[PDB]
Amino acid sequence: GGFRPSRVVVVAKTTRYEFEQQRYRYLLALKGSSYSGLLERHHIHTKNVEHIIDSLRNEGIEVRLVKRREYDEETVRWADAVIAAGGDGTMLLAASKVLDRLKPVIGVNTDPERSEGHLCLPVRYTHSFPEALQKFYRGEFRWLWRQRIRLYLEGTGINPVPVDLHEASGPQLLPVRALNEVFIGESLSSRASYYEISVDDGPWEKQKSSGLNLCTGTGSKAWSFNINRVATQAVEDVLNIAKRSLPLNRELVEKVTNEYNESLLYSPEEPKILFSIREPIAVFSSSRQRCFSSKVCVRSRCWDACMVVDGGTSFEFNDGAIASMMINKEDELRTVLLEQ
Amino acid sequence: GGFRPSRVVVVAKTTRYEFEQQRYRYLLALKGSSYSGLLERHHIHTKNVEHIIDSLRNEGIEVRLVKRREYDEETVRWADAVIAAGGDGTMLLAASKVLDRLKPVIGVNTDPERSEGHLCLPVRYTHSFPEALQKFYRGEFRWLWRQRIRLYLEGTGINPVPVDLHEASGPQLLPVRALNEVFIGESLSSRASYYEISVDDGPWEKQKSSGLNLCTGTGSKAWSFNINRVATQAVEDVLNIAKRSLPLNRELVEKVTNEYNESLLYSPEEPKILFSIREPIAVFSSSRQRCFSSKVCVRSRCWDACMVVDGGTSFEFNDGAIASMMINKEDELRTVLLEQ
Ligand SMILES: [Ca+2]
Ligand SMILES: [Ca+2]
Ligand SMILES: [Ca+2]
Ligand SMILES: [Ca+2]
Structure with a gap:
């Protein structure tokens, strides 16, 4: 019991003001849907961020503060621990570059009244953040090893190169894990998806639907909820x-x-993949709207489709490709639990 | 009572063999998922097509036979009537270029055991097609004027140029009608949609969901079904x-x-737009999973989203744009009804 980090990376959400400050770098205001509180959205993110890094450095922890574009697998290895400073978006991004069940990653809700934060420390510690660091020292916390889906691509016509959405071959391992989900489906949201699924090495059934969702226990409150609720x-x-x-x-x-x-919710530490069929189209018969499993492999029969992990990374999954999801232990991600 | 056409356009689906014959024009077979019956899929489409045009010409009707790329508003005006020769895909495409409630358009299911055809003449007339033409002459049929959704774009940052998916401004009228539906939503199927809807000129409520569907009576058996079933x-x-x-x-x-x-199904002649919210995310509150209305206008608050009419034409609908759907009489499309 006990944990003080010696070096940390703070990776920060890029606010919606930061967006346009650099996007349209090529008065102002424009449509009434901005400035009124858009420059205030920014003012209170950077506020909280400085409080975090002020409260790190004031306890003698060494911090590199970096944004989406400067956070990489190399800085994560310098880090004794990793802090996402944003919303769950940021948390998912920060978990993307960690693949080591002993690195802790901790999310601080940098903006409570509009971020959600259900993967971050409570809203308390966003502004009393030494109170968190002290609890870490004194061990008044608990370790939450969150299950993560691991990806596997093979077949033919395949292309395992990842795609940041933030802009005859053997089984290759795709280099993101899934904290939240893995969503197979057609790219045109109007083109229907077609594939053959196989649960726990059972026989292959054909299917036609608006896609496949594949979530972890922790990801069951995310997309797999809105699908099935x-x-x-x-x-x-x-x-x-x-x-x-x-x-x-x-x-x-x-x-x-x-x-x-x-x-429809189960536990983050639970090692099952709750996989639902999104709006199934019942010829190819249907049943099992959703079900728990340990391994599911699907065979793409689509024209221009992707499988998308945690909404941030995409992989091609056109006809001839095969994917295989499974929870494996060295994937589970090391989160913390604190108090209201 | 009675109807014989003097000239007709037959617009034909481009089969999946035609696809690759021209797509990879840049042995063969490749993956076991072809040739076995792929060249047979083609053989029986062109078979039926020749039967249609053989049975037209043998009754002294003059036909131009044209495919997706050679079917345009100019050939539709030569036509006394229009025939889609494929599946409902083809029917929707053929209706796209007709905007005149007195032009008849009739679908012939060119391939019954795998097309569906729920907008085309029964499977009977696919191979006894003079029996249809005779019923048309003798008036043993009935007129089905199918309701169609009409589109209206305004606001700012807008771009009313249509997009064939087959690859301060006033209210402009978008040049496709909707036979089946109009689907607003974010392009990345993982990016959530945000907008303000207003039903029958009621107040604007905010909303966050995986998109908006907007169907006709006839389109209520299409997508609006899989959404809500x-x-x-x-x-x-x-x-x-x-x-x-x-x-x-x-x-x-x-x-x-x-x-x-x-x-969830109502009648094609019924003039209401059944508009559902696809997987609503309930802060911005929700209710009304779906409801009937005559006019609905939605205000885009999205980043990179489209509104997509009958799955074939797309329009940009990013933040600042406004759209307005309404059934208007000169849109209703002139289909026929025959017998089992
Ligand atoms: Ca300071
Ligand atoms: Ca390929
Ligand atoms: Ca012939
Ligand atoms: Ca624009």
Whole structure:
């Protein structure tokens, strides 16, 4: 028990003001949808960021502060620990370049009232950040080894070169892990996807849908949730045709949805891949809207499709390519847990 | 009652063999996923096509036969009537270049065992096609004027130039109608969409989702179905938590889903736009999973998004642009109805 880092990398979200300051570097304001609080969005990110690095350096920890474009596998090795300073976006980016279950990576919600932060330290430590560093020293914290999906590409016509979205061959290992998910599907969101899935080495079934989602326990509150969740206005629709027991009050409408959406979440440390079929098109038959597994391999039959890991890295997955997802231990990422 | 066409355009799907014959014009076979029946897919499309045009010309109707690239607004005006010779794909393409509620357009399912055809003449007339032409002469048919969504772009940063996916400003009218749907949403399928909707001139609510669908009565069996339909394996999941009346047999599981999915379809002649929010993300609050309206206008707040009409034409719809959908009479498309 106990942990003080000697050197850390702070990798910072690039705010939406930073965006245009460099994007349109080629008054101002323009549309009323800016400046009013856009330069304030920026002012409070850099505020919090300076508080973090002021509070690191004031405890004698050595910090390099770097943005999306200057954060690489080389700086991560200098780091005893890694800090994402943004939202979960930033956390996912910071986890992308870590592949070592003993490097800790910790997210600080650099802007609470509009970032979400469900992978970062509580909103408390965003502004009382020595209180965090002290808890780390004194060991009043806990280790959360988060499960991560590992990728594997083979087949023919394949191309394992990764693509930063921020702009006859053997089984190659793709160089990102998935903290949140791996989303297979067609590029044109209107072109339907077609493939053959195989769960836990079971037989191959054909499928036609708007894509495949493949999440970790921790990623089950992210995309795999919006895929599969039900709506309270459409359980009233389902429970009223289920009329022709209960008198059906509004209190019940929420207590049937809230126990349904509660089964779609499992635990970060749990080592299962919850893989759902997004809007399946039921000929090729369907069933299993979703299910838990350990290994799933899908065979691409698409024209121009990608498999996309945590929304930031993309891989080609046109007809002839094969991918294989599996949780493996040396992938699990070392997060911390603190107090309200 | 009665209708004989004097000249017709037959516009033909380009088969998947035609694809590669010209795409890789830059033995053969390659992957086992071809040739076995790929050159047979082609052999039976051109077969049926020749039967159609043989059966036109043998009744003394004058036909120009043209493919995707040679079918234009000029040939549609020569035509007394227009024939799509493919699947609904082809039908939607053929309707794209017609904007005149008195031109008839008729689809012939050029390949029944793998095309679907739910906008074309029955599978009967694909091979007994004079039997169709005779029914047209003798008036043993019926006119189906199918409702069509009409598009309207304004605002700033906008760009109303259409994009064939087959590769301070006033309200401009976009030059495609929607037979099936109009799908607003972000281009990266992982980037979330954000916008402000306004139904029937009601107030503007903000929204965050994986896009917007906007279908006609006829388009309600297409995409708007896969968006909103329920699964029989996840009503068992909903009706078993709705346990803690019925004993729940498998016969019921289908009869509650089949009456739910039955309310998501309305009639082609019905002039309402059923607009659903695709996987809404409930801060900006949500409700109304879908609802009927006559006019809906949405205000783009996206970075790199398109609105896509019938899957074939795309328009930019980044922040600052405004679109407005509405059914108007001179759009309704003139289809026929025949017998089993
Ligand atoms: Ca300072
Ligand atoms: Ca290739
Ligand atoms: Ca002939
Ligand atoms: Ca623009």
